[PDB]
Amino acid sequence: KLPNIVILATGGTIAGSAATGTQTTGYKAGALGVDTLINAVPEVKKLANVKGEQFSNMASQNMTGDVVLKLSQRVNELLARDDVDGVVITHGTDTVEESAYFLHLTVKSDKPVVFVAAMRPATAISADGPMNLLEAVRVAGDKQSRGRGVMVVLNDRIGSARYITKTNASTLDTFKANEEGYLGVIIGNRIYYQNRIDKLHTTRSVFDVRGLTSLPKVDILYGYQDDPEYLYDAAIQHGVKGIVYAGMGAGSVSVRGIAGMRKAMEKGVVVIRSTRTGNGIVPPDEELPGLVSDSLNPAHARILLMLALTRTSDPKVIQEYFHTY
Amino acid sequence: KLPNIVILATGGTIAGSAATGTQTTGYKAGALGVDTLINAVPEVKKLANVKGEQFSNMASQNMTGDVVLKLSQRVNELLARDDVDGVVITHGTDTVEESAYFLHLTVKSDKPVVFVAAMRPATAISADGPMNLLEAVRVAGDKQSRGRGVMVVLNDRIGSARYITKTNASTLDTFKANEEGYLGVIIGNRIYYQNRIDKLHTTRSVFDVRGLTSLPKVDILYGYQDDPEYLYDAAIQHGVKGIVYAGMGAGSVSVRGIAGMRKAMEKGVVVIRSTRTGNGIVPPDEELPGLVSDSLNPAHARILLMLALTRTSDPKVIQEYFHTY
Amino acid sequence: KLPNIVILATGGTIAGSAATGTQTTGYKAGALGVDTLINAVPEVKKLANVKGEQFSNMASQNMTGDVVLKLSQRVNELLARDDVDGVVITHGTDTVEESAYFLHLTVKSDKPVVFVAAMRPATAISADGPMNLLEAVRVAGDKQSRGRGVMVVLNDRIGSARYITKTNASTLDTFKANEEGYLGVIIGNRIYYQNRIDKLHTTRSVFDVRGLTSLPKVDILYGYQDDPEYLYDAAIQHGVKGIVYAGMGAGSVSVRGIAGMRKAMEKGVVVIRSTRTGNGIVPPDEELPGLVSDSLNPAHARILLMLALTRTSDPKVIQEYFHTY
Amino acid sequence: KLPNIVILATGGTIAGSAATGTQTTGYKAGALGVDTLINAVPEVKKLANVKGEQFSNMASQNMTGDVVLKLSQRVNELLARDDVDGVVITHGTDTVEESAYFLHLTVKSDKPVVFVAAMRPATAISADGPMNLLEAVRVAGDKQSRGRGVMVVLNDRIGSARYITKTNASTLDTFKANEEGYLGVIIGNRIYYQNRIDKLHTTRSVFDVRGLTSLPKVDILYGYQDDPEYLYDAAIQHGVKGIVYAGMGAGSVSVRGIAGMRKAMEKGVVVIRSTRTGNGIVPPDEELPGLVSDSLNPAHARILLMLALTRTSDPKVIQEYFHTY
């Protein structure tokens, strides 16, 4: 027996199709159907019995928490089946780290869930999607891949959903985790596992969203010279339950940001101080408002905070989640 | 014999002083005076005739465009003097890239301007500031350092103001330019120059702010799943002239972001699409609203846009500035 | 209350002492005694009951396998004691990755073994050794540090012995593992664990060298354009049991290298093909002579091969060790 | 209208051809002819009038200094012609940095010379060579590419021959210059120049090898724990004129290495201390034997030393070359 893998498609440049091979604008991300991706790499059938299912077909900049919630619920159904050994999810690069991390916290199975994406459309010269998809299927079907949390596979690398991020606007090697590295790499049709993440996920995670149809509102505000108080006022006004702050340095806040945060907290908004820098630890500091994001970047921090707020409003518990998830 | 260097102090953790050597919260950034920094490294007097001038003493997260404008005007006065060979500017790490890039565009001299900072306070065990300051002074006093644009010096590295960024919340090696590298390095008391930036700066820059007392209002908004339209409404409402968008991937915009941007542009707000990723090129795309940031990250892009708006409101000219500065 | 930590000193720039603070040549690495290091950071005594033991005092470029063997044997004696909770080993940066990886494979305890080093001498301005030592002691005394394999601590980072390497000749942030990241980081006097290495080590390792008094001879030969066959001849002639080849690219071998390798193997020399590149996988290739190093760089590969050859001469078993250690 | 570009083919995995699309051993590097590469990307004809010339067809691990000398001589002939605007050289990845740097020092023209390579064979799924070639042709034909020294183009990046190196055995993104960055990047069919190298090359280089038919013999020896003296004896015995030492840390030498080096120097062998670390400066140290490689890695250092020895045996002049080329 080959493993049985479902390829659950959501869209992205991996399913993008353009007029010529050199073209990288004007084409639609999420134009091609899941079977077209599979038929472009017939080699996948030597690795697994694959079945394509079209979940959606959108550019990932339009992916929304309400859709991601349904994606999570669907993956959980699929993995509950005896005839499904793993799932590969095709997705746009722009917000794959948000969807992936969401599933990392909410999927109740040790079976592999592997997000895969492409920086060049399927019609491009030296398109990356075909090899990226092959590698994702190899990963999803290996018995050694079980219990590792949700994975993001591109460019011969296996990244943990919790650490991996799109570090570059436009390159093929954009997905990196500068301080945490890759869980593994795929070279010469062989998987080499290097690390296991030392964080809670999947079957050891408290978060369960089955039955939910929507999520708490969380917005992200940037920190910079002359950052304005009025954006905190606007967020509070629009009923946010959480604000993630993409702070200067180690979550440092200006006098204007401190004023906005204190206002937010008066209204019961939970504030998380993250960093705009790209990497590293925002340490605890009792003198400043809000909780701290540990090493979660702003986009990951929003996902965790949303999920946390489905369960609790207790700052002590939420802070512990940030240190452990 | 020796070069004459002014050390112009603005604050920062480099001037921070705590109760113990292991302490890194509760202490005040910008507590120590410039002469206390100089007297902690008397070795600097073998490199240069140094003179300390206290420009300000704040944490850099509170640095503002109006103050940076005065800093630029002061540096231009200093460099106009025959008895000043270069300037070293002590500053906080959190927004040094913004202040540095501002001076990179507005300083009308080939004499060296070198920003220097520290991630650990002056009282810390293995504090970095002493050696960082020594290196900055060596750089500022070398004849080979002339004509290179504004520099940021920490941890044995010389970064261009246009490329360097704080990449990590909390580490000593935080300042990197992943795609562009360092202008040079300082090893064994010797400067090794590697690159010259291929962009316009200082004496070849069209931007001149002498006589200005304030700058156009420019805000930065983040891109993420479920990003809200109402933050664009708030910005427009508060009279911004420019919005920098810290976009998903290559400046990709959601349907909500597109609606906010189109509204902004109807009111004459100039929109620049940058990236939240940390690195790389946002390419032109005539199908999407706004201009593109080229390789300027959101913080640098705000600075350039502010300065551009002091000279023009022509999108074609502003776009050209983003490709040349 | 506090853990009991032995600080076992071997030398290195961490123990180096120069005539001035800016000096970085002419000084002797491994000049200062272990108690002088401890007394320079009295803060260590709030973290642990420390005891210094002078094992040696040499520059690490002179460290030899016979000495490393004794170091391993000693650490195993120390860790067998009820009154020792962990060991910190002060060492030179140049070959710390070789000594650390040796201990990683031979130390029969889950108690922490933490190597520490410094790129600047103890007398330098902004010397890194004091903070590095303090961090190493924090790591060695934490209960959470147990069972993680041997660690190398510098510059706020905790590297696994198996992955970490000196990547730069002269910088403070030199120790990195580009593909595998750090096991953890130490920020704000707090340890943040990120990864557990997915390889065999310490208490799950087959390698045991207690009672040995010497090791098999293994040399390292470089791969490059016009590489010569006569260096393989010289190695065979001097009785090597193993050759690690620091190959072009993915362990690629010239016609001359193939000839040298075939000669070596005819004499029963075990050949491992590694890479000079710095990073990544050398994949299996039945067409080429020798075994492959997986992701072990040449220095690590020499250590593993030496240890392997104390137990077996079976190529199949040795190759498996390279994929699992 | 279009620039005239010669594509001069030497072999490599870019010209490699395998039995299936997933295969990466058993195939021959340098199997396909230059016209087959060109015809696989007919899009190149919109960028340039291209002409293929087959210089050789070998795996680059077999490239030799005598062949590289001919390659340089041929490129100089081509660039002397009015009907040649630039040259793209197809080559294997394993030693492209050595051949590229050789040309960087010996090519007497400001016209672009661009080396290009591929990590996956031409028959692979998601092969990189087609896009890499197209980018190389774009770079070679752009007027803005003149006067930049020799370039290595892969994966959307333009590296200087002096800084770029294969950092990873097996990945597509392997070519990096960690401290010096890229000269530029190619994104969205547009070239973005970031840096100019601050070193002597091409038209400003003293090295001229036209008329030479062979080069001085230079070998490379590795530095590691227990490194043997007898390899220096072997090298001396075989008539080397130079030895490059791939040293521990900053060119640090063991007692055994010092003895070998002193022996070599007595026989008039020039010794250059480089580093095995991958990056950074080997600083001067008059106490230790030999000259220092500045930031040249061992493979580059061999190239420069060979060329230096064609002109001089004066240590002072050779050392100055290492600081300026």
Ligand SMILES: N[C@@H](CC(=O)O)C(=O)O
């Ligand atoms: N805009 C695309 C970008 C990509 O997939 O590369 C997406 O995220 O759907």
Ligand SMILES: N[C@@H](CC(=O)O)C(=O)O
């Ligand atoms: N908040 C401090 C951080 C530092 O300087 O390291 C500042 O930017 O002033």
Ligand SMILES: N[C@@H](CC(=O)O)C(=O)O
């Ligand atoms: N030569 C020194 C270098 C250092 O420790 O930084 C050593 O390895 O002992």
Ligand SMILES: N[C@@H](CC(=O)O)C(=O)O
């Ligand atoms: N063996 C090949 C490797 C490659 O081109 O990727 C070469 O250097 O010729």
